[PDB]
């Protein structure tokens, strides 16, 4: 068991499991925590960036995909780059060909299908990264959770990475409050920072440690780093 059935993604275990996919899932858990949440007017990403040394920079975890869509990552950053690039192209294709901003729901379906092809063919490997996609389209604010198994889920709020369960239980309690935060971006970010801090343990949220992103009704997807997020610590 396990030993014999985890050599490649093309092999089912005797209980119907896909261990290579499950090992890829484990790369996300080792990844640094990031939180997503939304109301009816805005959607917010908050991420805890990780460094190597005190001499090193903090690995950026948020990537803009279009003016109305973007995502945060936990796991293999190179794989997030590939998937975010694909999403950038799909968003771009929709605009050029149909003059239409891509629905966040359709973006989720496209990621699912792209991840799935890597879980059924020989020689490849699953993607070793998880993604939280936020956006504002023709049906309002949206937040998605992408796992490299191919499973994509629309949520009000969630978290991924190490110790992400803390932030997730907080949001699960705070649900009725933060969903009502309409027409107030600062207050949604506060609720996102209070959630991300639930997953802390090692350190405190410093100025070059924290990264935040916001998208909404009259707000293009925009990333905040450094002194721009000093007012939230």
């Amino acid at each position: 068991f396990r030993n014999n059935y985890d050599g490649d993604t093309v092999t089912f275990s005797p209980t119907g499991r896909l261990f290579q996919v499950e090992y890829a899932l484990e790369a996300i858990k080792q990844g640094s925590v990031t939180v997503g949440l939304r109301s009816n007017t805005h959607a917010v990403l908050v991420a805890l960036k990780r460094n190597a040394d005190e001499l090193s920079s903090y690995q950026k975890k948020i990537i803009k995909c279009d003016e109305h869509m973007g995502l945060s990552l936990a796991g293999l950053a190179p794989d997030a780059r590939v998937l975010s690039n694909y999403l950038r192209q799909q968003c771009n294709y929709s605009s050029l060909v149909f003059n239409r901003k891509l629905a966040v729901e359709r973006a989720g379906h496209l990621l699912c299908d792209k991840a799935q092809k890597n879980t059924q063919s020989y020689g490849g490997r699953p993607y070793g990264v998880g993604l939280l996609i936020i956006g504002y389209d023709k049906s309002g604010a949206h937040l998605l959770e992408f796992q490299p198994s191919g499973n994509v889920t629309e949520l009000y709020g969630t978290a991924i990475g190490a110790r992400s369960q803390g932030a997730k239980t907080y949001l699960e309690r705070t649900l009725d409050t933060f969903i009502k935060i309409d027409g107030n971006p600062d207050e949604l970010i506060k609720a996102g920072v209070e959630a991300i801090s639930q997953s802390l343990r090692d350190e405190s949220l410093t100025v070059d440690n924290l990264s935040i992103a916001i998208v909404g009704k009259d707000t293009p997807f925009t990333i905040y780093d450094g002194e721009a997020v000093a007012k939230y610590i």
Binding site: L96, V97, F98, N99, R100, A103, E105, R106, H109, K138, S139
Partner: protein, 233 residues
């Protein structure tokens, strides 16, 4: 590269205060042979868009099938396919424009001139032209073929600039369209008496009228015309 065999003549259109009107006759010509008399050259897409097509009929039927596929494909994994994520006139057009320019760039055009008439979700009128060269343009009145030479002059007397649109009613707009179809029946040798007319109104929706005929024609003066100069009887 090709040559058109079975052809449709003018497509004419204009916008009015609350929407757009578009008309085209029911003829499929074969050179100077008036071959087919039951050809519908207005293609409705959903409840908000009508595409009028002139030129090669074999290509028109191909474009017709592309539009049906667009509706099908749009409804896939789309819970809001008949609401917020339904097809807009602008999406239909941009898709067609893309195809028309790519085909001309491959030296293998769809040998047509297309007018997409409709109403966007926000209530705005949509009226835009595209043809075998991939050339696009918008105007308060649009027409293809002979309609460009004879209908536009008459339709522009009603709506000469943007500011004439809110002043123009459905009744006045429709009468102007119907008069233009009579004028084209007088002077276009590839025209038919029978035509279809479509109104797309931001309040009253899509009104499709089939089996219209040119009426109230002036011919009586012809009896007084004898000879070609000097002949009296």
């Amino acid at each position: 590269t090709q040559q058109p065999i079975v052809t449709g003549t003018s497509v004419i259109s204009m916008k009015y205060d609350n929407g757009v009107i578009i008309a085209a006759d029911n003829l499929g010509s074969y050179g100077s042979l008036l071959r087919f008399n039951g050809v519908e050259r207005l293609i409705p897409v959903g409840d908000n868009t009508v595409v009028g097509i002139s030129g090669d009929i074999s290509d028109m039927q191909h474009i017709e099938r592309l539009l049906k596929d667009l509706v099908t494909e749009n409804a896939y994994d789309n819970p809001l396919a008949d609401a917020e994520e339904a097809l807009e006139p602008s999406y239909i057009f941009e898709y067609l424009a893309t195809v028309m320019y790519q085909r001309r760039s491959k030296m293998n055009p769809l040998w047509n001139a297309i007018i997409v008439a409709g109403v966007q979700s926000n209530g705005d009128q949509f009226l835009r032209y595209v043809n075998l060269l991939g050339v696009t343009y918008s105007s308060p009145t649009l027409a293809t073929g002979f309609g460009a030479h004879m209908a536009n002059p008459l339709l522009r007397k009603v709506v000469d600039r943007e500011s004439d649109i809110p002043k123009t009613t459905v009744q006045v707009a429709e009468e102007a369209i119907v008069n233009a179809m009579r004028v084209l029946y007088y002077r276009d040798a590839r025209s038919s008496r029978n035509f279809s007319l479509a109104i797309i109104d931001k309040n009253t929706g899509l009104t499709f009228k089939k089996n219209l005929q040119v009426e109230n024609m002036k011919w009586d003066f012809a009896k007084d015309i004898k000879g070609y100069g000097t002949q009296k009887i």
